[PDB]
């Protein structure tokens, strides 16, 4: 009856940023101490809380989002940001109350020769609403001309692969990120710490 | 950020030749950069996108390769409409692109040494208070040349400017003018105004010169 | 009718404002990465700013907070307002649709932005006289003229072979000096009359100056 973080932060399989991944946690406990005594993360900022004095802070249920993004895009995962990622892959709300945890995983997410399994939505007609998930693969239509499956002028496939390759400068390496989302509506809050 | 870099600053090639331009980027941009052609006065023209996908409306003789960090454009038979500067761009940070210095493909030709002519300042201009001396390395190949100015056998540095012409429609040869600027008081306190020029066509350097009163 | 015709920009002092216009036609600027890229005479291609489909913008540190990319999605036009202009901004500006990996395929016609606080002045025409010591050379110095450009001509067009007219130089005072020269048979040193005619339209100036050898 502990909150199953161990299967989110240590999961061998992360999803692409565009198809970011979510796990709702409820009915358990949580040791937010161990997460920031591990001290193995590169970036760990928390907005609208404070990791230490959060073990007494109970919440109805907490969400844990995970994906993978270029090292210099982790600045886009913050409340009030814009860019390729925050605008078309995962947008954080202005009034955000949670934590953003990232840790360079180039020793696993950029195999020899280039890892092309991780993608990032590149073309979109308007921006994401907070915690929105766009999975559409339909051919992006830049012009008046309906594409209907044909790549070509004014016709672009929206999802572009990262060129993950380990020799690249750190900025262009894979950084596994897992955003923690704490919410509390008027209902039995069951995600307490000790 | 990502640094781009072209190989030969400007190569020389003939019609029917098979040219090869290079381009290498700071990180391992994996197959994510296109090639562009620009002729003076016009806008860039896309040729190859995504390393090697040919652009529609582009002749068959334009190739494309490179996948990792070191790329290369290669034209099969250089046709006359292909003499222009070619740049490369990185579409890794797609919204935020960069280019290379460009590589200017001109016309190959036999070496031609430049005829040097030095001109003194006109008495008309001396009235206005400043003095202009002009040297001249008219008609030669290739572009590269080294014009030193010497006033009373003392090299001049920050006070000269240069301007080159295009390859002549008929010569295929270049021309140049190095314009030294001085004052009516400085020009008047020195006699010997010479112009030294070094070029591949000249065994040794040529000096066209003159004295204040002659 | 895929094309982008840009307009709005000629000459303005260091600080003044000038808005640029890119009139898209064929694609839609509302759903495309619309960038501006600037380019000087003796320089490469430099990116200036961006506007996404989601309306988000971004500009290079040498611009941030001085220019401001815009778009009117009712006239399918891309704009760029240029405030607190300076001399570094003098360059040709191209609007182009960045097709991401597919590359910048569509490009704006062209728009020049010469920027300086120099006052328009018809140029001086000093003569370059042939020297004593098979062939002799001579020409004209079209010194100190602003703004650009100026066209040269010898014997009203009766002389062409050999005549070179150079690309203009912008010198330290903020004015352009260029020279035009022709080589001729030395045997006509003092036989024919050579006159280099210059024209600077911005200052309405037209000059004809005979060139001969003093001694
Ligand atoms: C990830 O697993 C390691 C053991 O391999 C452990 O030290 C760490 O606490 C785990 N992190 C969790 C469960 O958050």
Numbering used by the authors:
A (entry chain R): 334 to 527
B (entry chain L): 1 to 214
C (entry chain H): 1 to 133, 138 to 219
Lines quoted from the article behind this entry:
The RBD is responsible for interacting with mammalian receptor angiotensin-converting enzyme 2 (ACE2) to mediate the viral infection of host cells.
Among the mutations, the N501Y mutant, firstly identified in the UK,2 was the most abundant, followed by S477N, N439K, L452R, E484K, K417N. Mutations in the RBD would differently affect the epitopes of antibodies.
